[PDB]
Amino acid sequence: NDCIFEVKHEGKVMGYACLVGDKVMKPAHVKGTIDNADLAKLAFKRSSKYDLECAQIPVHMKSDASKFTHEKPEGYYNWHHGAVQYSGGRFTIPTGAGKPGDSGRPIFDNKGRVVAIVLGGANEGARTALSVVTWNKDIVTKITPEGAEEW
Amino acid sequence: NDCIFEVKHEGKVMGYACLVGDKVMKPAHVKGTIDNADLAKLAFKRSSKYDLECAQIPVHMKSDASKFTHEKPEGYYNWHHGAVQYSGGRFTIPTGAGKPGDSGRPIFDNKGRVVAIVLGGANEGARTALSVVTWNKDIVTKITPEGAEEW
Numbered sequence: 028n029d030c031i032f033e034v035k036h037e038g039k040v041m042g043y044a045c046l047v048g049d050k051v052m053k054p055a056h057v058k059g060t061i062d063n064a065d066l067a068k069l070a071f072k073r074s075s076k077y078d079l080e081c082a083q084i085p086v087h088m089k090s091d092a093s094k095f096t097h098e099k100p101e102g103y104y105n106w107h108h109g110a111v112q113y114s115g116g117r118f119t120i121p122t123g124a125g126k127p128g129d130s131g132r133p134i135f136d137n138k139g140r141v142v143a144i145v146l147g148g149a150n151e152g153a154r155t156a157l158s159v160v161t162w163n164k165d166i167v168t169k170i171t172p173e174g175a176e177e178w
Numbered sequence: 179n180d181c182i183f184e185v186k187h188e189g190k191v192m193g194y195a196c197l198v199g200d201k202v203m204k205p206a207h208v209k210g211t212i213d214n215a216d217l218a219k220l221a222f223k224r225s226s227k228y229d230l231e232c233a234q235i236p237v238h239m240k241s242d243a244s245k246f247t248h249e250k251p252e253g254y255y256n257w258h259h260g261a262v263q264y265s266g267g268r269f270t271i272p273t274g275a276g277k278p279g280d281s282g283r284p285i286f287d288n289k290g291r292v293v294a295i296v297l298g299g300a301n302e303g304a305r306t307a308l309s310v311v312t313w314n315k316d317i318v319t320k321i322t323p324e325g326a327e328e329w
Contacts, residue, residue: 086325090304094266 030091031133032066034059043131046092047141050081054130054146056177077160077169078146093133094140097163104142106134117172118143118157125155130178134159147177181244182284183217185210194282198292199246202233205282205297207328228311228320229297244284247291248314255293257285268323269294269308273301281329285310300326 030046036059044053044061051066055078061067069082084092104111108124111134118134125148134143147158149172158175161168181197187210195204195212202217206229212218220233235243255262259275262285269285276299285294299308300323309322 086300087302089302089307 030093033062035062036060041128043129045131045133045141045144046084046088047133048092048095049084049089051084052131052144053080054078054144055080056146057130077167079160079167094138096136096140096142099142099161102137104134104136106145107132117170118145118159119154120148120157122151122153122155125178127178145178147171147175149173149175180242183212183214185212187211192279194280196282196284196292196295197235197239197243198284199243200235200240202235203295204231205229205295206231207297208281228318230311230318245291247287247293250293250312255285255287257283257296268321269310270305271308273304273306276306276329278329296329298322298326298328300324 032044032046033040034042034044034053034057041059042054042057044051046052051069053071055073055075065085065088071080071082073080099113101114104113109121112119130146132145133141134145136142143159143161145157145159149156149158156172156175158171161170182194183197184191185193185195185204185208192210193205193208195202195217202220204222206224206226216236216239220236222231222233224231250264252265253263255264255269259280260272262269262271281297283296284292285296287293294310294312296308296310299306307323307326309320309326311318311320313319
């Protein structure tokens with residue numbers, strides 16, 4: 028609710044940035060800069076294998092970061108536009124929800140812990156498969172279904 | 179309540195000393211002399227890596243000793259100035275509580291067991307994070323977040 032920030036370029040919104048744990052995360056293909064004055068001066072690392080950039084969280088903004096976990100049992104999860112379903116190791120959303128410019132929305136569990144960041148998605152008639160990045164013990168990983176298109 | 183004695187220097191209070199297990203403990207950066215007559219004659223050992231000093235308790239005062247453990251599950255804990263929450267491996271308290279000169283207070287469990295001793299801490303906007311010295315099986319360890327200041 029309060030931990031999400033907007034990235035703007037020439038008055039337009041193209042994507043979002045999120046604060047997780049003790050690092051700031053942002054999709055690689057999204058251009059522009061951060062609206063907040065303090066965060067815009069940070070130096071970033073870049074990695075074209077996972078389409079992520081990160082930086083260290085400043086001291087006085089630490090209280091606003093969310094929690095995170097790595098257990099992913101089957102069930103239902105929530106995000107901004109409703110309920111999302113997890114079964115077979117894959118993320119699915121009802122068709123028609125979501126448009127270009129909405130990349131970077133976190134996905135929450137029943138207790139408000141962050142598990143993933145969405146970037147892009149696939150096309151299908153009845154149900155839509157998502158393109159997501161998650162993490163495990165001491166690594167990060169990228170999952171991309173067939174035919175996905177960037178958001 | 180009964181296990182704590184006060185250390186003074188030129189009429190000013192600087193800190194506290196506790197009787198845990200079979201050992202007498204005190205933070206290193208605090209100067210002065212112990213109020214109690216019996217404890218003032220002991221010899222102490224020093225270690226600047228952990229910021230602790232210790233000495234062995236005399237025979238006749240052992241009846242006042244507290245119990246202790248090393249189990250640290252997630253949940254809620256309490257001390258003199260309120261309740262303290264432990265989650266994510268860190269201790270946090272509401273901002274503004276705690277002033278320099280209170281260092282050395284024990285942190286208590288639900289059944290009265292001692293689990294930690296507080297020395298210093300770091301201050302941010304809505305919360306504060308503590309720097310604490312704890313133990314484990316057969317050793318002691320020090321934990322310190324960024325920007326911490328002594329108390």
